[PDB]
Design a binder for this molecule. Structure first.
Ligand code: WPP
Length: 262
């Protein structure tokens, strides 16, 4: 048990919930894990895998991202800030990817899932890039039930960090596609209270949040510290009761412990 791991355990102790952390410092490829191999509900953090899978398809079905997708009134789910504006019209797969990632639009996510042939199509992409842990089982919004002990729509912090590294800094995607993914993550609108809130102001980052029942509060990020090689950081958090409140502050604290321990 390292000093950083002990600090994360202390944070978890006062948090009321269960915390999972995985850092990969590309300066030396070292990792810092806390409950790194335990499963957590991904919620919206799964949107990165879906968008990346569509980016991979676009490497060979070249005009895929410009392909229109019909948005019907019945497609709308619980949170669709972008899709609702296009009901009875269309959005391209690039628009759907941007909406899913940057606004966490759930209807947009469902269109990515549908393009991939269902939740299993997202899992299939995960397997193709070496992630044997990730599993997407349901569409939005039920993939957010986040029931303790339920393996559906879960992953481990270790697996997600390795995957995010491969996708954003490695070669799981073509160069243009990796750049597009990084651009989308950097333009996220929903992350300032999470991982980012625990980083020095001078650092830059891209991230994708997730939230669900059981006060499930997640964030996965690629970070560029001042004067350092990039980091990949996953912070997952989930609580014992279905109606628990969101705790983005716990993710921010975890990120601060990680930054202070570099
Ligand atoms: C079948 C019954 N059932 C299961 C429970 N459930 C949900 O927990 N959905 C969450 C959700 O959609 N989360 C998606 C997600 O992650 N993103 C989007 S929304 C967001 C911007 C808060 C978030 C982000 O980026 O942080 C959600 C959480 C917190 C408040 C409202 C909704 C349902 O939706 C649902 O219907």
């Amino acid at each position: 048990t390292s000093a950083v791991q002990q600090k994360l355990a202390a944070l978890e102790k006062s948090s009321g919930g269960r915390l999972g952390v995985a850092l990969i410092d590309t300066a030396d490829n070292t990792q810092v894990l806390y409950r790194g191999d335990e499963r957590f509900p991904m919620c919206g953090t799964s949107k990165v895998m879906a968008a990346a899978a569509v980016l991979k398809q676009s490497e060979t079905q070249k005009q895929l991202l410009n392909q229109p997708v019909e948005i019907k009134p019945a497609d709308l789910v619980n949170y669709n800030p972008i899709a609702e504006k296009h009901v009875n019209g269309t959005m391209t797969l690039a628009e759907l990817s941007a909406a899913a990632l940057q606004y966490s639009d759930n209807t947009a996510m469902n269109k990515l899932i549908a393009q991939l042939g269902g939740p299993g199509g997202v899992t299939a992409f995960a397997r193709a890039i070496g992630d044997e842990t990730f599993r997407l089982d349901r569409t939005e919004p039920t993939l957010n039930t986040a029931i303790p002990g339920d393996p559906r729509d879960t992953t481990t912090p270790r697996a997600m960090a390795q995957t995010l590294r491969q996708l954003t800094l490695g070669h799981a995607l073509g160069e243009t596609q990796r750049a597009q993914l990084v651009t989308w993550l950097k333009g996220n609108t929903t992350g300032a209270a999470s991982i980012r809130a625990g980083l020095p102001t001078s650092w830059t980052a891209g991230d994708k949040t997730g939230s669900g029942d059981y006060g499930t509060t997640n964030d996965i990020a690629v970070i560029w510290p001042q004067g350092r090689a990039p980091l990949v950081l996953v912070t997952y958090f989930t609580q014992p009761q279905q109606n628990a409140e969101s705790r983005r502050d716990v993710l921010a604290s975890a990120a601060r412990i990680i930054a202070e321990g570099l």
